[PDB]
Design a protein around this ligand. Structure first.
Ligand code: K
Ligand code: K
Ligand code: K
Ligand code: MG
Ligand code: MG
Ligand code: MG
Ligand code: MG
Ligand code: MG
Ligand code: MG
Ligand code: MG
Ligand code: MG
Ligand code: MG
Ligand code: MG
Ligand code: MG
Ligand code: MG
Ligand code: MG
Ligand code: MG
Lengths: 32, 50, 349, 51, 155, 117, 176, 140, 121, 200, 64, 51
RNA sequence: UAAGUCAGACGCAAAGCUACAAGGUUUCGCGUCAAAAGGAAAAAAGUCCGCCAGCGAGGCUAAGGUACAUAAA
RNA sequence: AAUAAAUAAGUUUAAUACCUUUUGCAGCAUGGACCAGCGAUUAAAUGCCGGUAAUUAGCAAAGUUAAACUAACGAAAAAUA
């Protein structure tokens, strides 16, 4: 479960929420 | 003290010879000092041969 | 008076990080590391106290670790660790010194890793900034690593090499022979420096002192001198040949093979030289990598030596080449050991 | 602030600072500190004059 | 004047050769500030009263017996080892081709100051004869010299 | 021990013999400096108490409570501190009310970099 | 799912605890409150922790990970929102601060917020007034000099005349 | 026992009769009776100001005896460090040794597989062969 | 600087030529005096040689502040530290402390100060 | 046991075990716990990722000469040097010492938490992307002396340690991110002339 | 705690140690829940121990 | 040090003139107890540690 | 350190002496004070929480609290 | 204990001197009316233990004083001849 949970968080670019190309799909962090 | 006090030092030829003689004179037992010098010389000669 | 009964048990095992009091032991810890995994843990524990001096030294340590694995592909942990050290270099890109940059490039070049083109430009800018003021402070070892390190990376910036050469030119007469040999290697490898004043100055500086050249450096100098200066304008090629004749028996097998091929290219080979080479090459044919075997075959063929019953060198070389291609040495050892399932790494030609 | 000279003179070269020691030698590393009130030494004990 | 000139105004002693004296009774933040490090009261903190060897009255040191044996007078002699005598001869400070007396030993430097005599002692393996005159000798030295053919005489 | 110059510089505003008499002023100077160390520590406690009172007064004018607001902010991931909130209630009533409505009712319109994805 | 390690956090201080309980904390290398360590799940470690269940909080590797990941997701940035409040009738006048009449509010503005006192040193230069108790220290050097001059050179001297002329100027300025 | 504190072994009569005597030579006996490399190092350290060539010659010879005791293994670290320090004294007294002392010095250092520096080894050789070996006659 | 205008007006360097306490000041002038002048074209820099006992620095500000500083037995690096704080400051007295709110504003309220909701008296 | 002399029993037992081990070899030669001891790892759980934050302050240019400022009708909240500030153009703030900036330079602040006007308010959760505040560096100064004094009555203990804090001063120039309400627009030039010297 | 009710030293107000308030009772309930919870966790760890112990890195052990 | 002459001397309480008698009664007067007028504490007295 | 100390005090828990008294006295286990500022109980050496290198108008907690005095339902 | 930290300047909050001596002192335990000047581990000889140097020390001037050193078990065999 630890391996299956680290991957999901790793597949998230939080630094891309302050790049002006963003929409309401770059903040849908939790449930893809 | 006197050498450091004054900026310049001037000496005469006989003075230079006398100063060096006193600064090299054996402190003790002149005879014993000569013996060790001779032994060192012989060792130095042997080193050159080898 | 007594509050616990029994013999004290084992101490608990606690995960700990490096404390600020031991920040001065980081360089020692890097040296004492004996594997990539250990070095990775040393850096991780000291993450909060890493400085540019530590990052540069770690990359240099990769060369020392990889040496123990000669004859095999670079191990995965080494590649993964290198992928992390590169990111640190990017963060400290503008805070390195000239001496530290030389260590970084040599370590990454030895591992056969290509540094990003943008990083090379930033690293290049550090070396040649401020009209090369810091180049006058780099010592002989730093200069040697800078020339060979950047050359091995495929750096092809004309401006960088122009400024670097100008700063080093007045110091060539006082460098050691081994350092001068490395400079010639770079000059011959760079086409645009073929016929410059720096190239001529290097040759004139090497001629006065050739007795101090090591076998490996001597062979490279002869190779580079022949390519750059086919006609002996400076008394370098003639002097190098004389040294080869005098001490032919003392040099190692690899250098003798390389130097012999150069003579044949120079068209100074004689039947006597070819006859003398054969007995030495035949005895030590097993100490020549595939690259040197190719040089030996071409040199002997050009010299005109013919197979003899006493010393059939061509037959021996063919067998040795087959062993290297097949990699039978690992299998042969396993046969004596009795465990044939032993892993066998190889570097396919 | 690592160096105040680099802050008041943004476009000049500032030599490296001299190494400070408890003993107080002025000749450490083949360099002489011009602000020292004593003749140059060799950076060790006993004190010997370096010309 | 250049920087490297030496005059009476730029001399200092070697670091670590000197250390400042402690002057006590000179402030709260000074070393040994108020009470000078002696404590508060008692006999020790009131000047020169108590000897450092007094133990409180038990007097344990004088509870042991007394011995009156007289040591031998030969403890007043200068002791010379046979191995040291040979070393001088090998180096060439002593002439082994003639009789060796205490006068030769004094001049050679084997014995420093003589008031009564010289005592010869020890064991040594010799290959050449030696004739030496001393004031006293043990049996080990006599055997060692005589084994090589020498003669030891007590004068 | 302070010198005469230091003592009288500190005691220039004291009353009576405490101004120019060394023995009297020296004891008054040392006691005052002790008060200052305690004073700087207490200042930090008092000011935070004042911020909370002003915030609570503003919250209750609308029918809310301070403790409900602090909990509500943490759920919305709003990290405004008490110094800023206190100033908003006093000088910016409209902005202070907007924060309360978002926490209580969550009826704010979201803003995205790409207005039309 | 095997439990491979434990996370131990300190809750209470060393003060007032028995010396045979402080040793257990020192073996686990806990020195501050809220400090956490990771240890291997072994029978010897569990036995020691059972002697001080009131000083620490204990959780497994899985529990420690899940708790910290939940906090991480909560602290991630979220889209901003806007709230509109319409005031149809607005005035164009800029009202002053309610305490502008206070001299203390004005002093702060004069010192930091206004373009004031930028006309030059000569215009704004002023001489400070020495407190009465400090005057024996501000003029010590001048008093010594006058004594020095009169004692060595006498009163029929050029230096003495200069001092007297300066004293005449000071007395004349007293009449205001 | 009764003489010394708890844990201190009692005296050996054989060793006691050697050390208790009316004759001098205390330092020589202390180094000769050393039972380990560390013990010999402490003796030399506490007696530095009174060491002489005779003391250095015996110290190097003792390295032969300590090595013999520690058989079944190569030369240990303490032995190597002790030999290195002794070499500095050999250089200092290189011009004051006799033929016999030089003979002991070489034997001890050779038994530990220690290579004397060529410059120092040449000096020692010169002492032995000086004067055409006329001093070699006064040797056993 | 205030509204883009520098506040320091002049800087005076006082020192002796043979005094040992001025050794550090002389080194600073030899090596860094010229680069300092070029960096600050708007500053009037003056050097005074006298027979006084110790060197000193004097700073004069456009607001009328005077700040003499003693640089006795200091090195160039220590001297530069004093200069950094003198040049970049407004020259306020050593006893002054800035407002405790850490903010001075002329327009404190944009929407208006809070007022009671009802008929006041 | 009544005696207060430290016991030597551990020393006596150690000397006995050492003598036996020296002379008598052991029978076993392996230990399973040592044989299968695995490589050392940093931890048994995945590492917790960090939360990104906007840049604190960055230089963008310098100021050429004297300028003037006028009042506007917008405000915002910015996080800087560990504390939050409510700012509007022409305000002066005091912070801790900021490294890497010089007087008469313009800096950009991006950690904006709240923007407001007389007709709308924007709330960041916790930061507003696409907003910034500009300011000019005016001073690097030492604040007034703070006298630190400690004493213990009747214990001969006294300590005095004066100190001078380091601080930085800024003047707010512009707030970007929210439009003024209708009729509140400033229709004239407001700020200085800035020489841009930061291109990325 | 102090139970003594005699003497001139007023450890407690007149009347002895006062009874606990409702908040004090709630405070003591939560302190015991933490203690019981810790013991429950140690039981889970013992019932799920792996065969091979994990090896954790420490810089100080590495140096020596 | 060799050249220094060192001809310097002072007087202690036993070398200053007079001071033999006890100046005050031990008890009763309300003044501090004193033993001699040439004590170091008194003006004109001897030196505690004379040269 | 060839230093200082050899006048100790109380809380919880036991035993002897006293009267299963004393802020009594004699031993013993732990803690605090002595040599320890800060917070809670009214003032508070020894009880409960907790150990002060310095500054700041940032944040989270402990013991204890959450209609007024007096911060928080 | 006559001050401190702040302030919209109206005021609000915090706060029982110092020394000496004690298990414990705001102490109803001791000393001081205030200012200036004077006022207390110093010198010699000897011994012990650290630090820094000379590389024996003092006289005399090829010869004398002082100190220091002076036998413990002659134990190694590393030759791919
Ligand atoms: K003492
Ligand atoms: K506690
Ligand atoms: K008075
Ligand atoms: Mg007493
Ligand atoms: Mg005492
Ligand atoms: Mg606080
Ligand atoms: Mg009472
Ligand atoms: Mg609670
Ligand atoms: Mg008199
Ligand atoms: Mg007693
Ligand atoms: Mg007692
Ligand atoms: Mg009692
Ligand atoms: Mg006491
Ligand atoms: Mg809270
Ligand atoms: Mg309330
Ligand atoms: Mg009493
Ligand atoms: Mg009185």
């Amino acid at each position: 479960x630890x391996x299956x949970x680290x991957x999901x968080x790793x597949x998230x670019x939080x630094x891309x929420x302050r790049x002006x190309x963003x929409x309401x799909x770059x903040x849908x962090x939790x449930x893809x | 003290y006197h050498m450091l006090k004054y900026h310049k030092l001037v000496v005469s030829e006989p003075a230079v010879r006398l100063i060096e003689q006193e600064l090299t004179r054996p402190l003790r037992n002149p005879a014993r000092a000569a013996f060790w010098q001779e032994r060192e010389a012989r060792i130095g000669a042997a080193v050159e041969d080898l | 008076t007594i509050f616990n009964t029994g013999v004290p048990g084992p101490r608990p095992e606690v995960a700990q990080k490096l404390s600020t009091e031991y920040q001065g032991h980081i360089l020692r810890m890097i040296s004492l590391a004996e594997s990539a995994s250990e070095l990775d843990e040393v850096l991780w524990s000291s993450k909060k106290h890493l400085r540019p001096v530590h990052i540069a030294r770690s990359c240099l340590k990769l060369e020392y670790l990889r040496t123990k694995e000669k004859g095999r592909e670079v191990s995965e942990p080494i590649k993964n660790l290198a992928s992390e050290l590169e990111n640190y270099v990017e963060l400290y890109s503008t805070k390195f010194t000239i001496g530290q940059v030389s260590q970084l490039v040599r370590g990454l070049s030895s591992i056969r890793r290509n540094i990003q083109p943008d990083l090379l430009l930033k690293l290049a800018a550090v070396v040649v900034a401020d009209d090369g003021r810091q180049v006058q402070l780099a010592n002989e070892m730093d200069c040697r690593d800078l020339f060979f390190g950047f050359f091995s990376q495929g750096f092809d910036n004309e401006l960088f090499w122009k400024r670097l050469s100008e700063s080093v030119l007045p110091r060539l007469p006082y460098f050691n022979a081994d350092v001068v040999s490395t400079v010639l290697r770079v000059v011959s490898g760079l086409r645009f420096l073929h016929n410059t004043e720096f190239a001529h100055a290097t040759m004139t500086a090497l001629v006065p002192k050739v007795g101090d050249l090591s076998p490996a450096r001597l062979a490279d100098a002869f190779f580079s001198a022949s390519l750059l200066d086919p006609t002996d304008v400076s008394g370098l090629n003639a002097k190098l040949e004389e040294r080869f004749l005098r001490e032919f028996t003392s040099f190692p097998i690899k250098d003798t093979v390389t130097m012999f091929q150069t003579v044949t290219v120079r068209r100074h080979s004689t039947p006597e030289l070819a006859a003398q080479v054969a007995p030495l090459v035949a005895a030590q044919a097993h100490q020549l990598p595939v690259r040197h075997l190719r040089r030996a075959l071409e040199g002997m063929v050009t010299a005109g030596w013919k197979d003899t019953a006493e010393i059939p060198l061509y037959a021996i070389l063919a067998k040795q080449a087959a062993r290297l291609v097949l990699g039978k040495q690992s299998a042969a050892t396993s046969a004596i050991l009795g465990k044939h399932v032993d892993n066998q790494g190889y570097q396919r030609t | 602030v690592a160096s105040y000279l680099a802050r008041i003179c943004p476009n000049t070269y500032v030599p490296p600072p001299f190494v400070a020691t408890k003993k107080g030698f002025n000749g450490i590393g083949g360099r002489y500190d011009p602000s020292s009130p004593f003749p140059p030494d060799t950076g060790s004990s006993p004190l010997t004059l370096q010309y | 004047n250049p920087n490297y000139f030496v005059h009476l105004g730029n001399l200092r002693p070697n670091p670590g050769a000197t250390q400042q004296r402690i002057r006590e009774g000179r402030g709260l933040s000074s070393r040994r500030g108020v009470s000078c490090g002696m404590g508060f009261k008692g006999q020790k903190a009131r000047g020169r009263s108590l000897h450092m060897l007094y133990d409180g009255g038990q007097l344990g040191l004088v509870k042991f017996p007394v011995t009156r044996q007289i040591p031998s007078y030969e403890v007043l002699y200068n002791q010379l080892g046979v191995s040291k005598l040979v070393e001088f001869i090998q180096l060439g400070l002593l002439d082994h081709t003639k009789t060796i007396t205490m006068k030769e030993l004094l001049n050679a430097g084997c014995v420093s100051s003589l008031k009564y005599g010289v005592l010869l002692y020890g064991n040594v393996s010799l290959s050449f004869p030696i004739n030496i005159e001393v004031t006293a000798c043990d049996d080990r030295a006599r055997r060692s010299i005589e084994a090589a053919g020498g003669k030891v005489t007590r004068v | 021990t302070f010198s005469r110059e230091q003592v009288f510089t500190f005691a220039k505003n004291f009353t009576g013999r405490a101004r120019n008499v060394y023995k009297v002023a020296l004891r008054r100077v040392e006691r005052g400096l002790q008060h200052s160390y305690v004073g700087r520590k207490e200042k930090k406690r008092t000011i935070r108490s004042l911020w909370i009172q002003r915030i609570n007064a503003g919250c209750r004018e609308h029918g809310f409570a301070y403790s409900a607001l602090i909990n509500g902010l943490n759920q919305e991931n709003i990290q405004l501190n008490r110094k800023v909130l206190s100033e908003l209630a006093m000088h910016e009533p409209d902005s202070f009310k907007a924060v309360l409505d978002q926490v209580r009712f969550m009826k704010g319109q979201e803003i995205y970099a790409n207005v039309e994805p | 799912e095997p439990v491979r390690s434990l996370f131990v956090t300190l809750r209470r201080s060393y003060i007032g605890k028995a010396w045979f309980h402080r040793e257990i904390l020192q073996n686990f290398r806990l020195k501050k409150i809220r400090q956490t360590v990771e240890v291997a799940n072994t029978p010897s470690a569990r036995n020691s922790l059972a002697k001080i269940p009131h000083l620490v909080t204990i959780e497994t590797d899985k529990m420690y990970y899940l708790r910290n990941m939940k906090k991480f997701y909560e602290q991630l940035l979220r889209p901003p929102v806007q709230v509109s409040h319409e005031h149809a009738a607005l005035s164009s006048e800029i009202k002053p601060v309610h305490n502008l009449h206070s001299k203390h509010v004005q002093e702060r503005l004069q010192e930091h917020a206004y373009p004031s006192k930028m006309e030059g040193y000569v215009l704004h230069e002023k001489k400070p007034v020495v407190p009465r108790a400090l005057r024996s220290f501000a003029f010590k050097s001048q008093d010594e000099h006058k004594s020095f001059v009169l004692a060595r050179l006498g009163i029929f001297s050029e230096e003495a005349k200069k001092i007297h002329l300066n004293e005449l100027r000071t007395f004349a300025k007293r009449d205001r | 026992g009764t003489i010394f504190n708890t844990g201190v072994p009692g005296p050996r009569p054989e060793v006691a009769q050697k050390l208790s005597t009316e004759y001098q030579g205390h330092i020589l006996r202390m180094i000769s009776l050393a039972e380990s490399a560390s013990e010999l190092d402490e003796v030399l350290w506490s007696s530095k100001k009174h060491l002489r060539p005779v003391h250095i010659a015996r110290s190097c010879l003792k390295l032969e005896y300590l090595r013999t005791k520690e058989k079944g293994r190569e030369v240990s670290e303490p032995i190597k460090n002790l030999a290195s320090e002794l070499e500095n004294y050999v250089e200092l007294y290189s011009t004051k040794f006799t033929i016999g002392q030089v003979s002991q010095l070489v034997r001890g250092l050779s038994s530990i597989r220690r290579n004397i520096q060529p410059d120092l080894l040449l000096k020692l050789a010169a002492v032995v062969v000086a004067d055409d070996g006329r001093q070699v006659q006064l040797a056993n | 600087a205030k509204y883009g205008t520098h506040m320091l007006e002049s800087l005076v360097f006082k020192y002796c030529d043979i005094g040992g306490s001025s050794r550090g000041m002389r080194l600073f002038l030899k090596d860094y005096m010229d680069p300092f002048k070029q960096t600050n074209p708007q500053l009037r820099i003056e050097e005074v040689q006298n027979r006084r006992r110790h060197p000193m620095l004097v700073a004069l500000y456009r607001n009328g502040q005077c700040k003499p500083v003693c640089v006795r037995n200091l090195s160039p690096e220590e001297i530069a530290k004093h200069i950094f704080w003198l040049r970049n400051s407004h020259g306020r007295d050593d006893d002054y402390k800035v407002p405790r709110s850490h903010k001075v504003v002329r327009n404190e309220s944009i929407q208006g100060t809070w007022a009671p909701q009802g008929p006041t008296l | 046991v009544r005696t207060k002399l430290p016991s030597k029993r551990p020393f006596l037992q150690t000397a006995s075990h050492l003598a036996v081990n020296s002379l008598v070899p052991s029978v076993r030669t392996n230990r399973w716990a040592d044989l299968i001891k695995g490589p050392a790892v940093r931890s048994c759980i995945p590492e917790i990722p960090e939360v990104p934050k906007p840049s604190e302050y960055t230089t963008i240019g310098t100021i050429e000469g004297p300028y003037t400022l006028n009042l506007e009708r917008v405000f915002g909240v910015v996080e800087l040097a560990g504390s939050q500030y409510k700012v509007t153009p022409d305000d002066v703030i005091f912070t801790n010492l900021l490294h890497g900036i010089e007087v008469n330079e313009v800096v950009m602040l991006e950690r904006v938490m709240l923007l407001g006007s007389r007709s709308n308010t924007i709330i960041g959760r916790p930061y507003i992307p696409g907003a910034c505040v500009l300011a000019a560096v005016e001073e690097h100064f030492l604040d007034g002396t703070v006298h630190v004094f400690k004493r213990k009555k009747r214990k001969r203990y006294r300590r005095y340690k004066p100190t001078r804090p380091m601080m930085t001063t800024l003047r707010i120039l512009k707030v970007l991110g929210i439009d003024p309400a209708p009729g509140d627009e400033l229709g004239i030039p407001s700020g200085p002339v800035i020489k841009i010297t930061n291109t990325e | 705690v102090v139970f003594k009710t005699t003497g001139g030293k007023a450890w407690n107000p007149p009347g002895g140690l006062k009874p606990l308030t409702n908040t004090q009772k709630r405070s003591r309930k939560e302190n015991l829940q933490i203690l019981l919870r810790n013991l429950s966790v140690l039981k889970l760890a013992a019932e799920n121990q792996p065969e091979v112990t994990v090896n954790l890195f420490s810089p100080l052990k590495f140096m020596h | 040090a060799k050249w220094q002459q060192g001809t310097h001397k002072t007087k202690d309480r036993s070398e200053v003139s007079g001071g033999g008698r006890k100046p005050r009664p031990q008890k009763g007067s309300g003044r501090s107890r004193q033993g001699s007028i040439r004590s170091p504490i008194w003006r004109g007295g001897g030196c505690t540690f004379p040269k």
